[PDB]
Structure formats: C-alpha cells, structure tokens
Amino acid sequence: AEYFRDEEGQDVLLFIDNIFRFTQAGSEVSALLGRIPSAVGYQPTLATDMGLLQERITTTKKGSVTSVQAVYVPADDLTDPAPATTFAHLDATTVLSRGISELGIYPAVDPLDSKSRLLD
Amino acid sequence: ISYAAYLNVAAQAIRSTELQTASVLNRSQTDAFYTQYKNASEPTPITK
Amino acid sequence: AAVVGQEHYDVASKVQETLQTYKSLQDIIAILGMDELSEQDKLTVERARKIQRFLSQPFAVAEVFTGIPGKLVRLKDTVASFKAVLEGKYDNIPEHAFYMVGGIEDVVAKAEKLAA
Amino acid sequence: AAVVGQEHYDVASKVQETLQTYKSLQDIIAILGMDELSEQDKLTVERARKIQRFLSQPFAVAEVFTGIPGKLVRLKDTVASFKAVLEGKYDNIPEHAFYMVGGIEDVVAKAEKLAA
Amino acid sequence: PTNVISITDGQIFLEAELFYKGIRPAINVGLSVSRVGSAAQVKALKQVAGSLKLFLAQYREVAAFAQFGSDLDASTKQTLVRGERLTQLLKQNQYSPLATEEQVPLIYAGVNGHLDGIELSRIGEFESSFLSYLKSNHNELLTEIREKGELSKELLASLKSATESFVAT
Amino acid sequence: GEWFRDNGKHALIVYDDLSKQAVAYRQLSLLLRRPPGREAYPGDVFYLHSRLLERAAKLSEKEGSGSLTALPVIETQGGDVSAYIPTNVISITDGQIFLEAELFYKGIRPAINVGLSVSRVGSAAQVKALKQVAGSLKLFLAQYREVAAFAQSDLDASTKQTLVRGER
Amino acid sequence: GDRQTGKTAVALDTILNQKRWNNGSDESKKLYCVYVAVGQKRSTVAQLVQTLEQHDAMKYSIIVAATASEAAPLQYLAPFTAASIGEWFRDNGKHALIVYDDLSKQAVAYRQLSLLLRRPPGREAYPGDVFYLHSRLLERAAKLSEKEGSGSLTALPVIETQGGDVSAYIPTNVISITDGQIFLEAELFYKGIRPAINVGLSVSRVGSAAQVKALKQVAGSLKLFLAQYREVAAFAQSDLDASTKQTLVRGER
Amino acid sequence: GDRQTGKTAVALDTILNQKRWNNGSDESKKLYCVYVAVGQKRSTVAQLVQTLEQHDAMKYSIIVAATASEAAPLQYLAPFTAASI
Amino acid sequence: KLQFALPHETLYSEVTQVNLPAKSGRIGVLANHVPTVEQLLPGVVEVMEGSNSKKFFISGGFATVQPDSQLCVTAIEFPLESFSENIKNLLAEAKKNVSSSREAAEAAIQVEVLENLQSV
Amino acid sequence: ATLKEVEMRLKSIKNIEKITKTMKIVASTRLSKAEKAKISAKKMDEAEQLFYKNAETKNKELIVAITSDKGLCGSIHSQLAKAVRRHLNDQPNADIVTIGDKIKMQLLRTHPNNIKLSINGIGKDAPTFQESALIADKLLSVMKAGTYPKISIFYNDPVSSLSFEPSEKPIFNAKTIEQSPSFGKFEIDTDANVPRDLFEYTLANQMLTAMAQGYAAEISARRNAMDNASKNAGDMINRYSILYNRTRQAVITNELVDIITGASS
C-alpha cells in the first residue's frame, strides 16, 4: 500500500479482516516469546503494535492509504481491551447490520449507529 | 320478585329463542358469590 | 426406551413432562397467580404435586432419622403405580396421602388413614 | 444495651430493621411501584425515606462546600429525636424538611419554612 | 471454606441480613445443615421441634410468593402467619442463654399452634409471661422436664393444658 | 481421511470431542512447563484446532473432486459458549448446531434448538426439492418462537393460529 | 469521562478562554499552557496544532508529544519531562497551566514496561507503583506560596473511563489524588448537552476560593438548585406540585 | 458467616450455657472449655476475659491465645497445641 | 325521534310511529306524544321510522318520552327470538319447578315469552 | 458466584421483562372489549340521564365500590380506596358494599364495621346485566336499600385511555323520584308504582354502567402499568449487563493472577 501511496502517489483502501484475530495472533506470539500476558489475555505490547500499524496508515503528501478493518467483538464486549484499543485508533465506524438488510435496505448500515468523527 | 330480577329472568329466558350465540350465553351466565359479611364476621359466600 | 421397557419409558416420559411443566408453571403461579392456568394446566399441576410427593417414600436408614421403616417398592410395581396416577385413578387421593409413603396400595391405605 | 442503655439499643434496633427492610424492598419497588406493594410496608418505606434524609446534617467544617452552617446535636437529644420519628409523630412533613438539618425541632421548623 | 466444610460433621451458616432483620443471633437456617444429621439433642426437645423444620421451609417458599403481593390463598397465609411468629420466636438476647426445660414449653406452644394465634407484636410479651406463668404454676412441669428430659403422656397433656390456660396470656 | 479425500472420495469425520483434546494439550503444555494460555488452556490451541479443522475441505476438480466433510463436537461447560476454547472454535467453524437442554426435558429427544443453530454455508448445498418445501418452515417456526411466550389466556386469533401451526 | 467525546475539546476551550489574559499585559495573569499529548494519533494532534494556530494561541503554548507509535518507556517518561519544563515557569513564579491528555494511556504504557520488567501484576494487571507514578506527577504541579512568588502550574489530567466504570482501580487511584473531578456524562453528551458535564458527580475542592466574587454572588446556590433539579427529575418519572413544576421548568431551562 | 458479626458472641453463648452443667455437680456433663483466639488483638481477648470473669465462667475456661502480634509460627502451632491441652 | 339503547348495544334515532306494549296496555307514539314514563312489559314492539317498519321483540325495560321528543327506550336482551319448541318444553319443566320454588317467576315469564313467541 | 448470581438475576429480570411485555399484550386484547362495553353502556345510561335531568330528580346511605378481584392493574384499587375514605369522613356510618376482592380487602381494613355485604367473582369477568340484576336484588333485601333514601356508588371513570379518576355518583331512591321537581309533565299512573320500579331498574342500569366504566379503567390502567413495568425491567437489564461484562473481565484477571503466581515459581 505504501509503495502505491509513496511511490505511485495513490489513494489506496486497505481492508483488514478480524483485527480480533490480529490481536489474538499477537497475543499468542507474545506468550510464546514468554512475555507476561497482560489483562484479558492480550499481549502487554498490544498498544504499541497497534500504534505502528495504525500510524503507518496516513495521508502523506503523495497519496493516502485509508483502512477499513473488521472488528469481531467478543460477545460485543467493547470494554474488552482489544476492541477498546481498536476504537481509539478508529476515526469512524460504519455499523453494518442484518436487521437493516431485513428492512430491505441494502446498504444495510444502521442509520443511527453509523457515526464518524469526520461528520462535522 | 323484584322488578329488575324479574326483567333479568325475562332477558335470560328470551335468549332461549331457538337460536343461540356464545356471547349471548356469556352475557347470561355468571359465576360470582355474595361473600356475605356482617358488622367483620362473614356468613358463608352464597353463590350468585 | 425399549431397553427399559417401551411402556416404562412412555410412563416415565409422561412423568417427566408433567414435572417439567409444573416447575415452569410455578413461576407463572408466583407472579401471575394460578388463575392464568387453564383447567388442563391445573390438572397437570395437581398430578405433579401428587407425583412430587409420591416419590417421597421412607427408607430403612431413616428409621434412625425419623422412625418410618423403608418402603422397598419393586420396579414393576412402581411402573404400574405411577401409571395409575397419570390415568387419574388415584387423583381422588389427597397430596399428603402421597407424601412419605410407599406404592399405590399404600397410598390408598393412607387415604383411608387421613379419611379416618 | 446497658452499654448505651436498653432504650437506646431498642431505638437503634428498630432503625436497623427499618432500614434493612427499606433496602430489601428496593428491588421490588424499582421493578414495580410502591402502590402495588402492601400499604403497611409502604408506610415503613416512606418512614425509612424520611429516616435517611433525617440522617443528613450539614458539616460544621465543610460549611462552605455544603453551603449550610453545620449541625451537631446532643446525644441525649438525638435519642429523643429518633424515638419520635419511629413513632411517626411528626412524620407528615416533606422529605426536604428531613434532608440536611439537625434535630427534630429543626425539621419541624424547616417544615414551616417550606410550607411558606 | 471449601476445605473446612468437607471436614466437619455439620455447618452452622449464619446470615448477616437476618442479623439486621433482628434475628440476632442470626442463623441462615436454609444453609444450616448437618450431613451426618441429628441424634444428639434432648429427647423431649426432639419431640416438640419435629415440624419446626417443615413450617419454616414452607414459610420460606410462601414468603417469596408473598412479597410479589400476588393473591395468596388462606393456606399460604396460615403458613405465612405461622412462619412469622416462628421467626419472632427465634430472636434471642445476646449473652442470655435459655435452659432446655424452658425451651420445651415455647416450642410446644408454637408447634401446637397456641403461639400462631397470638399477635406478632406481643409474641415477646407472651414468651416472657408464659415462662413466668410456668414458673409460678407449672413449676412442677419445669422440674419434671429438667429431671426426666423426655416428655411423657402426662407431661404432654399437662403442657397442652398449661398453654391453653395461659393461651391469651 | 486424507487418503480417501485424495483418492477423490468423500467421507465424514466427526471429531468428538475437541474439548477433551484441549485438556490433553493442556496436560502436555503444563508438563512441559510451556505457559498455559487463557483459561489455562494452551495459547496456540487455536492454531492447532484451526490446522486440524482446515484439513477438512471440498477439493477442486483438478484435485480430483473429493472431500472430507467434518463435524467437530465441543462439549459446553454447562452451556457456557463463552470460554476460550468455545470462542476460538466458534470463530473457526462455519456453522454451529446448538442443542438445547430445555427442549430435551420438554421431550424433543434428540433436542436441537434451531434458533441457536446456524449454517454459514447452509442452503448452498441442499437438495433442490427440499429447498422448495422448506423456506416457509424457517419463517413459520420463527413466528412460533415469538408467539410461544404469548401462549401463557385471552389470545388473538392470528397469534392463536400461528401457535397451532407451530405446535404441530 | 469517555474518550473522543471531544475530551480534548474541554481543555482547548480553557486555553482559548484565557487567551485574553495570556495575550494580557500581566505575566502573572499569563498562563503559559503546556499540552502533553500522550497516546494520540500524530495526525489528530497535528490537526489540533492547526486548530491552536487557527485560534492563534500556539505562540503562548508548548506542545509536548508522545504519540501512540512512540516507544513505551518514552511515553512513561513523557509527562514527567513535561512537568520539568512546567516547573521552570512555576519557579519563575509566573502563571502556567499543564494539561496531561490522557494519563490513563500512560498507565497502560507503564504497565507494558513494568510487565516486561517482570514486576508482579497489581490490580487489573496495573503495576503497584502506578500509584507512586501518578502521585509523584501530580504533586509536582502546584500553587506555590508568596515566598516562592506564588507559582501556579495548574494541572488538568484527562482520564479515559473505559465503559464509564469509575469504580475501576486506575480511576479511583486518580480520584483520591486529584482535587475535585469533572465527570462527564456520556448519555447527556449524546443527548444534545454539549458539553455534558454531569454536576451530580463533578466536584472541586478549593474552587470556592478561586473564581471572582461576581461569579460567587451570581452563581450562589445554583449548585443547590440544580441538585434540586436532580432530585426533582429523579421523581418526575406522576403528580407534580406547582412547586415541583416550578423547579422542573426552571431546572430544564 | 460474615466476620465478627458477633461471630465471637455465638460461641460465648455456648460457653455460658455450659455453666449450667459445669457449675452443676455433673462431672460427666462438666465441660471445661478452651477458647482459642488466633490473630486477634490483645484488647479483644481482654474484653472477652472480662466478660467471662463477669459471668464468672473463668474458672473452667482456658484461653489459649496467639494474638496477631504473636508470631506466625506460634499462630500456626497454636491450634495444634490447644488440641493437646 | 325514537331512540332505543341496550346494554350490549342499542341504536334508535321525529314524526315516526312507535308501537309498544307497555304497563299502560299498548301505546302508540306518533311524532310528539305527551312526556311519559311507562314500564315496558316483555313485549313485541314495532318501530316505524317513516313508513318503513322494523319489528323488535323486547325483554321489557322502560319507555320514556322526554319533553324534547326523545323516546328513550332501554331494554335488556332482540326480535332475534323470532328464530324460535324447546321454549315450550322449558315451560313444562318450569311449571313443574314452581312446586319447589324464583321458579314461579320463571314459569310466569316462560308463559309470557311463549305467548310472545306464539304472536311472532 | 458473582458471575452466576449476576447471571441468574439478569435471567430473572429478562423473564420478568418478557412477562410484563406479555401481560401488556393480553391487557390490550382485554382493553378493546372493555372500551366497547363502556360506550354501549354509557349510551344506555344517557337515556336514563335524560329523564333524571328533565325531571330534575336529584339525590343512612349506601356506598358501593368496585375494584376487581385481580390486582397489578395499577393504583386503581388504592386511588378508589382513598376516595372512598374521603367520603367515609362525610358519613362514617355508611354501609360499604365491596364489589371484587381488591376493593374488598383495602376497605375492609380501614373499617370492617361498614362491610355488611361484599361480592366476589366479578373482576375476572366482563360486566353483565345478570350480575347487576342479581346484585341489585340482594341490595334491596340484604342492605334494606330502600330504607336509605341515599345510595351512592363508586367506580373508576376512565378519564383518558391513559388515565383514570376514581368517581362516585348518587343513585336515585324512590323517595327522590317521587318529589322530583318536574314529574308532572311526565305521566304517572296510580296503576303503576313508577318510583318503586324505576328506582329498582336504575339501580341496576346505573350499576352496570358503573361496572363497565370501572372495568375499562382497570384494564386500561393495567395495560399502562404493565407497559411501565417492561421499561423498569429494561433499566435493570442495562445495569446488570454492565456488571456482567465487568464481572467476566474480573474472573479472567483473577484466574490470570493464579497462573502468573504459578509461573513465577
């Protein structure tokens, strides 16, 4: 993406699947490395790993990557650190739902749970 | 017999003419009890 | 089912459903009252209350705890005795005359005991 | 009792029981209003709400922060005041009257203020 | 706590809420169990307190139903009323133990329904007075219960009569 | 299974139950002093189970048109579907069947609760005949669930009709 | 309160409001304000910087930065270092202010370091010297005595309540140190009150000898009144006496 | 049950009723009672002994004590040496 | 007008003719009639708004011409009784019943209603 | 522990929510019938009221009051009890006839001397003429209703389909009917005893209307109450949900500490 952005001056859009499984994977590697698993299992280096990932996605003066991530909340418990850390990095949330699809509306995005910090 | 008891009997009698309705039958059947009281003390509840 | 006897199974299945209904309906009785239970539901409840205490029987080792000598009630006899209750043949017997006694014959005898 | 006296102990006992009741019915009250609870209990609950408010007295050091000059009432006076409240003698005046004030006499007087 | 529970012949669970509720000493009788069970306790006192367990157990079920404010049949309210009186009986003054000879009457009164009649407020009065009455009159009865520790027909009848005589205090 | 699958044949492998497999891995890890993961079940148990469960697949036609259907069984800890091993497995699996204890007691024996059963591939492979006669059934039962708790007096005809169809 | 409810915005408004005294003529009325940015997107901070320069306030203010990417030990040392700068102004006696956004994220950084130093985990896995860190930080911000030339260094530290659980260990530890709290009610924030600072749970412990006498006179008892509004609206959800209605109407207004 | 909610007081009540036989001549119903206090402050124990002396049951009572101040080994050893007595 | 209400439902609503069997014999009302209260006997009633006539079998009640020409008729339970020998059999049972007992009143009513049935 | 007791309590709250929801639906079903009845009844009553107005009839005493057997209909029972108590100040000696269990219980407590006749088995049913007529027949005989030249009835007027105001009205005794200002325009007959008949007839006809009004207010109030109940349960769900989520995290943490402690050794 960065080769596109920096060296081809492109706007890119980066999908990620579960960032829960990004966290989960990181947590395992941490544990394997023998580092004390921090609260709710997740790695003590959880924050820093997100920091690199979510500050390497930005608008440079050449282009900008933008990233859509999928957050598989564990039981919808947003209080869990892995969702919380994700929400800190996220700027907007588009809150797709199946209920909306069932009201025939595709886009199936929740009308009042879709929120952005860029809507101003 | 009291006039409204007499008329009640008349209304009830009049619904059985030859034809019937469940709502009619419900309107003509009631299960209730005069839970007789006294000045506390209760004579036995005599059914309506 | 068939292994424990198809009849035995069916009877016991009926008992279980009756009891399961009773446990669920206790909640309805608790808040709503017993007024929202239908006549059919009420009969199932009455049978369950009787069955619940039909199960109650004394044991030889609660001669020590109580004094009542145990009721050794054979399996074949139990299937029959429980079947009878479900058929409603001894639903003319009080709930407490099911309590802490043996088989159906005994339940009848304790009915006589409460009666006189 | 007999450390702070039986009379004190009895008065306190009733307070403890009353408040424990009030805490106990907090669930039931919240799920369904007090009008759907027993009238007798509803008096107890209202009394307990009053007792709770009665317990507040402004601080005589955080007079600024409370915004009310502090209240310190004699121990002998305190026992008398609660005794009356438990017998609900003067209970018939606002919750606000009970809130943040000293003695029973002060509550009564503040009721006159509130009434105006 | 898990370890000790296994070790002991019985457990005597106490409840803090019931302490505040006024049953002080407070016994959580629902969780007070003896796995091994009872056989050590005065024979007389064993006879009298026979259905005390049943009444209380029924009271517990009934009380839950009762606080929904749902319509209660008379049978449940017999239980409820009886249960309430029993609870009031249970409460006891700190540092004052009571001799078994004078616990047998109180349980007799309650179980034989005499207590169930008399009003909740004046249960404490009844208890004190009943004991005083037995001290005055049926002091022979107390002596016998102390001496023989199992209730004969004569004692049961005497006791029944005594309670009846002092039934409304 | 791979031999059958590789020969292009089909087969069904039922892993029963991976929960006890987990415990065994736990035993191994603890004995090897390798730190145990969340809920004291090894951390890379996810990796092991996923590796196992991804060796079940419908191969391509150049790969000889064969498959290894699989049906892993997980034993709930008193109906606890939250717990490290259930959550992980739930993520790996494509579909779930969730049997309901109440239903078992209530005489649906075997008991299945199809509200909590899901298929994430589902009807994509279904008998065409069976598709035709079974769209309605999902919807009818759905309504039946909702009107189940309205089955406790004075009932609207519509609800009562639903209730009758649903009970049957 | 909860992050990104414009948590940052509350502090910005303060810095800007005191622009008229920070562009004042008395330097003992000029707060030289330091913004410590811990755990924030470098982009967002850069926009914040632009906001400050748009509101032309940057020239009296410092920005210290410890972004989300930046190394966990550096983040740990980031407020402490900033406070050293703050103390120089303070020890010039001159007025100053320091905003630590967000110390809750600093706790997570110190947690990472501590755990990697194999210090045994404390409550919520936060190290036992987290208290020592915070207390040490907070007590280096002060209103000095006349002897020391009354050096203000007003600390405002922004705690990110996860789920609004204020019983949580890190928040309670902070609450016990801080003089007052400015609890924000998310429900109200969403429900059109912007800013939505619930005043039932906001306190200040020495504010009652800070603000001008005019704002004591006019504002007198309004705290009581709007905690009568709280009581009134508690029982609003039936019968309302004209007295109750008056309070409710006034309160709402 | 929950700590010191007259937790001690339930036990003391038993001791008081053991006055009836103990004081009584029945030596086969005479229970000499041993109250073991582990981890409790000297003042608590001291209050208890005053209560026991008030009820004058402190003649058949033995109080074996290992207060909180008194050593952890001695506290560990304290139930076992009470048992020996 | 003429207005007749009944406890389940009633509808009636100026120069029209009502024909009533009343505790005053039979009464006819045509337009304005004198303001009266009459006890309605178990009756066969004909009501004619204009020349159009609708025929009612009425269980007794009250009739009251108001001074504002509102003929308030209140009666219990229908000319539906015209659907109509179980009433004759019931009159036989009821006659027997008078021997024991209200049953006397019932049998009197049974004859009156039977007569009314015979009329219709 | 925490977790299970939270979870069980939350389950209870959920089940309660479902029940209060359910009750509200059944209440709506019942409400439709209730309102319909109240209309028809009131129209009939109005026909009688036309007479009483034009006659200008007006006017111990009787108190009759009505609140169903069933409760959890709201404060219908106790607002009526309060309003009975208010008019029991007026005449302390008035004999209260209590129609249905809820009004029976509450009034029986405040004065049991008054309670002489009481009914039961009314509340579960929708009002019917049969009930009113028989109750009326008993009212004359038992209460010697005619002896009292004043009769008064209490019921709950369903003010709005969200409100109820407990209400009372005076039934017109035969003495009152006799001396009614206008009665001369109306035709009396010596071969009729129109006071003695009309009194009896309007005793029931008014009472049936009162019952219909009461039943409608009761069922309406119950619907309102059961709706508000669902809301209260929802709030309880939300607080216990947050607790549940927190508790889950805490269990993980406590377990983790054990693992760490083990690992450290």
Curated annotation (Swiss-Prot), chain A:
Gene responsible for this protein: ATP2
Function description: Mitochondrial membrane ATP synthase (F(1)F(0) ATP synthase or Complex V) produces ATP from ADP in the presence of a proton gradient across the membrane which is generated by electron transport complexes of the respiratory chain. F-type ATPases consist of two structural domains, F(1) - containing the extramembraneous catalytic core, and F(0) - containing the membrane proton channel, linked together by a central stalk and a peripheral stalk. During catalysis, ATP synthesis in the catalytic domain of F(1) is coupled via a rotary mechanism of the central stalk subunits to proton translocation.
Localization in the cell: Mitochondrion; Mitochondrion inner membrane
Superkingdom of the organism of origin: Eukaryota
Family the entry assigns: Belongs to the ATPase alpha/beta chains family.
Further details from the record: Present with 164000 molecules/cell in log phase SD medium.
Residues with the Phosphoserine modification: 101
Protein known as: ATP synthase subunit beta, mitochondrial
Subunit structure comment from the entry: F-type ATPases have 2 components, CF(1) - the catalytic core - and CF(0) - the membrane proton channel. CF(1) has five subunits: alpha(3), beta(3), gamma(1), delta(1), epsilon(1). CF(0) has three main subunits: a, b and c.
Species this chain originates from: Saccharomyces cerevisiae (strain ATCC 204508 / S288c) (Baker's yeast)
UniProtKB/Swiss-Prot annotation, chain B:
Keyword annotations of the record: ATP synthesis, CF(1), Hydrogen ion transport, Ion transport, Membrane, Mitochondrion, Mitochondrion inner membrane, Phosphoprotein, Transport
GO cellular component, one term: proton-transporting ATP synthase complex
Organism listed in the record: Saccharomyces cerevisiae (strain ATCC 204508 / S288c) (Baker's yeast)
GO terms of biological process kind: proton motive force-driven ATP synthesis; proton motive force-driven mitochondrial ATP synthesis
Name of encoding gene: ATP15
InterPro entries: ATP_synth_F1_esu_mt, ATP_synth_F1_esu_sf_mt
Membrane-spanning segments: none
Stored Pfam families: ATP-synt_Eps
Name of the protein described by the UniProt record: ATP synthase subunit epsilon, mitochondrial
Miscellaneous section: Present with 4280 molecules/cell in log phase SD medium.
Disulfide pattern: none
GO function terms (MF aspect): proton-transporting ATP synthase activity, rotational mechanism
Subunit details: F-type ATPases have 2 components, CF(1) - the catalytic core - and CF(0) - the membrane proton channel. CF(1) has five subunits: alpha(3), beta(3), gamma(1), delta(1), epsilon(1). CF(0) has three main subunits: a, b and c.
Main location: mitochondrion
Record localization: Mitochondrion; Mitochondrion inner membrane
Family as reported in the entry's similarity comment: Belongs to the eukaryotic ATPase epsilon family.
Organism phylogeny: Eukaryota, Fungi, Dikarya, Ascomycota, Saccharomycotina
Swiss-Prot record, chain G:
Subcellular location: Mitochondrion inner membrane
Binding site for ATP: 1-8
Effect in UniProt of substituting residue 178 to I: In ATP1-1; growth-defect
Site annotation Required for activity: residues: 202
Residues making up the signal peptide according to the UniProt record: none
Superkingdom of origin: Eukaryota
Family note: Belongs to the ATPase alpha/beta chains family.
Function: Mitochondrial membrane ATP synthase (F(1)F(0) ATP synthase or Complex V) produces ATP from ADP in the presence of a proton gradient across the membrane which is generated by electron transport complexes of the respiratory chain. F-type ATPases consist of two structural domains, F(1) - containing the extramembraneous catalytic core, and F(0) - containing the membrane proton channel, linked together by a central stalk and a peripheral stalk. During catalysis, ATP synthesis in the catalytic domain of F(1) is coupled via a rotary mechanism of the central stalk subunits to proton translocation.
Subunit details: F-type ATPases have 2 components, CF(1) - the catalytic core - and CF(0) - the membrane proton channel. CF(1) has five subunits: alpha(3), beta(3), gamma(1), delta(1), epsilon(1). CF(0) has three main subunits: a, b and c.
Additional remarks: Present with 41500 molecules/cell in log phase SD medium.
Name of the protein in its database record: ATP synthase subunit alpha, mitochondrial
Organism encoding this protein: Saccharomyces cerevisiae (strain ATCC 204508 / S288c) (Baker's yeast)
UniProtKB/Swiss-Prot annotation, chain I:
Location(s) in or outside the cell: Mitochondrion; Mitochondrion inner membrane
Molecular-function annotations in GO: proton-transporting ATP synthase activity, rotational mechanism
An individual GO BP term: proton motive force-driven ATP synthesis
Annotated Gene Ontology cellular component terms: mitochondrial inner membrane; mitochondrion; proton-transporting ATP synthase complex
Keywords for this protein: ATP synthesis, CF(1), Hydrogen ion transport, Ion transport, Membrane, Mitochondrion, Mitochondrion inner membrane, Transit peptide, Transport
Main location as per UniProt: mitochondrion
Self-association state and partner proteins as the record states: F-type ATPases have 2 components, CF(1) - the catalytic core - and CF(0) - the membrane proton channel. CF(1) has five subunits: alpha(3), beta(3), gamma(1), delta(1), epsilon(1). CF(0) has three main subunits: a, b and c.
Function: Mitochondrial membrane ATP synthase (F(1)F(0) ATP synthase or Complex V) produces ATP from ADP in the presence of a proton gradient across the membrane which is generated by electron transport complexes of the respiratory chain. F-type ATPases consist of two structural domains, F(1) - containing the extramembraneous catalytic core, and F(0) - containing the membrane proton channel, linked together by a central stalk and a peripheral stalk. During catalysis, ATP turnover in the catalytic domain of F(1) is coupled via a rotary mechanism of the central stalk subunits to proton translocation.
Family to which the UniProt record says this protein belongs: Belongs to the ATPase epsilon chain family.
